[model samples]
Target chain A: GRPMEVLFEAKVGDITLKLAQGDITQYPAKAIVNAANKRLEHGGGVAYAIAKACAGDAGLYTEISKKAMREQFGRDYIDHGEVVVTPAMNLEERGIKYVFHTVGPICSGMWSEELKEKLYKAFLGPLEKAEEMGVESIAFPAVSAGIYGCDLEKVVETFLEAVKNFKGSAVKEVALVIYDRKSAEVALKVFERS
Target chain B: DALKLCPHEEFLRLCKERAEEIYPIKERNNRTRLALIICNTEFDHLPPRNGADFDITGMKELLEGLDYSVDVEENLTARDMESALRAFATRPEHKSSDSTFLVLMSHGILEGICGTVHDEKKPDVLLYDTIFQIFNNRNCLSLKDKPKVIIVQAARGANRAVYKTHVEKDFIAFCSSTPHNVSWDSTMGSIFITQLITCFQKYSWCCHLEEVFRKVQQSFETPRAKAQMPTIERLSMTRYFYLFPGN
Candidate 1:
């Protein structure tokens, strides 16, 4: 029932970082990060919603990626924390050029340094990949917060930290799209503290 | 005396009017529907199920689309499973709703559903009896007369036998395969869950639960399904239930 809110914004060098509470698929950006599995299946979470909106079908991205992977890598399996780029298909109508999909580690109710590092990599993977493609702007969902059961606060922090600690990149704008008010509020608190 | 000898059609009409007064069309439940999904993909003794994660994602989106407030727990042990079910049964939301859905996807045998096996050869399993008993009339009073629709997409055909002793009323169980038969899975996910999602997305608002199950079963006729046949067992549900009624 809560309307979309732009909770925080800051300028990082030539890059603009923004936190907004809304659907990531509706965000006007050149690229969007899909919190996806290794197989690039968009069955649930933010990835599913984005897939449906961008590709005009929820499962079309998987089909497109499967074909792309076979031709590009000679294999289909994408390991955990690996990043893969795929054409956005119908998303081109919405001005989106490509989708950077990365698999985040499952939390499993256990917290460890290794898990945090995996999440950190999951967040940075898309940003670095988008930079390589010379993309000026990209939108990201809260990675690993859904089905993977990662802590919301931790997810917000790790994503923000990844963006802050990056040394060099051509990406100019990074939008962290929070799906709900609770997550947006948490992210705002973390940003204030930072 | 003349009134008593009225036409047979008039008498029948009167009887129908009284019946309508006695049992008016019940309004659909406005409270949020709840779904508990538990998916176990990683196993210590068994080879990891590569496609189960897709099933988890599909089911979550499907249930949410049906307006269910879904809670997902992944990689639970036997003890953890029991705790999660019990916790779900006691939720205040169940008291205000007319139906509930439970989905369990994991590696299982003839005896029961298997849980996460951490650094051990033998996995901890939650017996079928234990799961059903928790929602029986005597235990889960909040849902005494409500429909408990369960979908289990586990391995092993013999696993369906665990429901042999479950005789609870208003219970509907759909298993991916018949007894002693193995179900099918692919890089996409379990055929059962995938088909279920397809049916729900297309027909949940216009069809009853039984019809949805029928469509899901019919979807497996393709060669890609690998001869998997889903079996549905309805215990005592007298009224048809719809996920999105009057859509």
Candidate 2:
């Protein structure tokens, strides 16, 4: 486990925004958001890791996740930038209550307006939904960065822009949780510049 | 004489009013959530469930997240399963709970689910009716009016009676596959259970019990589901129910 460090902290209205280096699953927040696929499958990357940690058993997240997909929406696919909420389960034992899953666009090494819009929506949807659900605190992973092949700097800048433009939300605390040190450093630099 | 009588009646009324103010009415039990999870992964006389432990762990976390205090028992014989269910139904917690959940995962035929036992010659079975009967309204009064959601993730292969007596009221049953069909299985775990868990995690907060099951049905249409369809038997629910209300 990498030690957590606070990269930046700012107050937006009544909401406290912080950029930190740590596991999103371990972040002590009321809700944690997962960067997921359209299928809402937690088979790989941050989604897979969050599922395993929250359930505290191997493959349990996928087992439960398959059921959620089948039973909740009656479909195997979720469109990009849409958010879904699931009970945080074992993470509740660690003070986390719910997991908000949001699907981001798969950036294939091309920067387009449409791709940026999707990414921006992906960043804002979970926070908005959390506020609607009366969740005061939320933690987010660096969406579209790891396996989706999105550039880290652009991802950070877009995420920060979304956070800055967020208005009339009920969420009091927003955390940008980055697991790797390099990504954390990049997010910190971008956040400072903005 | 009239003044003395009036004063005495007014004093008595004042004292009664003070007593009522001092002691408020106790609230009803509305927050207690309990679940019984029985997963039989190892069988001495039958084929072992190679990946069922994962399903069991997932169910526990899911139930806990739904506010259930889960009690999980693994690798039990038919006798042990019956005993455990009997014990669980009568626990003091049930008397005060608004809802309860029962999860039974194992290999099975149409008659009932399988239990781990030492036979070395024949497979031991735990009849589904016998296990569920313990929580029936007649048998377990503590949970009489509460919602009891029973999830059975067993492969159905034979044409036999699954339940001898239907639980009359406020009972919902989710069977992995319909009778005479084999439920999908994989190295990860039973597909039905996995999908069920996923549905609950994604939609339990806002969707009602029936809606959640319907979504599960939709996800099972994939090739991986292998024609296995989940069945929901709602005996007598007076109203729509949500597992985790208000998100």
Candidate 3:
């Protein structure tokens, strides 16, 4: 019902990077990232929410996601940094052009920074893809958090580092789409560190 | 309402309008009309396609009823799919054939159809362009100058990437959706294959391939399920191709 509410904003070169408290589906950006499973199944968490927002029907969206994954990669599951792209479906009307689905690590007891690097790899994959795709503005949900049980602090830091470090040629605008003001409040301080 | 075939007399009458444009239809009474059907239902890592059997059966029945000798393959890996195509291209039956029909039903992307063995760490595929390349004039000489009808029942073009092809001739493909779109299947069968079987049966008797394809495209205007636009692509026929069914 409401447009995106940006909590914090900054510039990387000529690009606009921000943290927003809103639905990524309604972000009016060029693309949104789906924190997907290896299978691109869209069964739960960010994957499920993005699927419904994209296709209006969860099963149809999942089918499309799986089909797109198989088509691009010739595989049912994707590696950590490999991202799959699909049309934004119902989200297209909202100016979201594509949904980039990438698998993030499930860091349950695997807290080793070695695995945390995988979290960094996870967010970096889609950022690179969006840039390579010439997506000037893209929204990403916090990867490796939520059901993934990764530390929110690390997730926030990793995403910011990826966006700040991955200088853009074709892509200029990057956004961190969060569910609530509280999470954005916790994450905004991290955005100021560097 | 139901789709209707052209009356035998009416079919012949329709032939008169595009006499020069229509590719000469040969009487198949002395030859084999062959079709190839390749479907992937079972996957090592992906969920099994529940209603894929319906697509396989429906396609076979449709093609067989038209007197085609069905050559079928089930659940092949990407490499195996290519291998299968190579073997089929060299089949002795094609030399004497008037035309060849190839139907591929599987999970797919803009790049091409997926095989049963495509894994995450290592992805492999039978590229769509390669399929045409395999049957192009120089490669599969038997089909040279002979019409080859390809029906692709898979989703493709996920990036919504606009594509920017020739040296190929007499080939036409009916893809399940426009580039950068998704195709669908259900407990009944795939949307593309079912509509294909439905529209081909009703119109092939009278229409040229282009018009027949148009009829199928029209069905999606108000689909019974999710909406997607099927397309006819890679069409390089110098003349109109007609399927002259029941003749």
Clashes of each: 4, 17, 3
Model 1 achieves a DockQ score of 0.03
Model 2: per-residue Cα lDDT over B92-151, one tens digit each: 877667778899887676677777763424657777667667888888898886778889
By DockQ, rank the candidates, best first.
Answer: 3, 1, 2
Off by over 4 Å in 1: A1-4, B1-48, B51-226, B229-247
lDDT of 1: 0.73
B39-139 per-residue lDDT for model 3 (tens digits): 98777755455457888889898888666899999999999999989888998877777788899987676788878876545665789988988888778
Give the top-scoring candidate (DockQ).
Answer: 3
DockQ of each: 0.03, 0.02, 0.10
Candidate 3 DockQ score? 0.10
TM-score ranking of the models: 3, 1, 2
Once model 2 is optimally superposed onto the true structure by TM-score, how far is the C-alpha of residue B230 displaced, in angstroms? 1.2
Decreasing lDDT order of the candidates = 3, 2, 1
By lDDT, who's the top model here? 3
Report the candidate with higher DockQ, 1 versus 2.
Answer: 1
Q: Is candidate 1 or candidate 3 better by DockQ?
A: 3
| A-chain TM-score of every model | 0.91, 0.92, 0.95
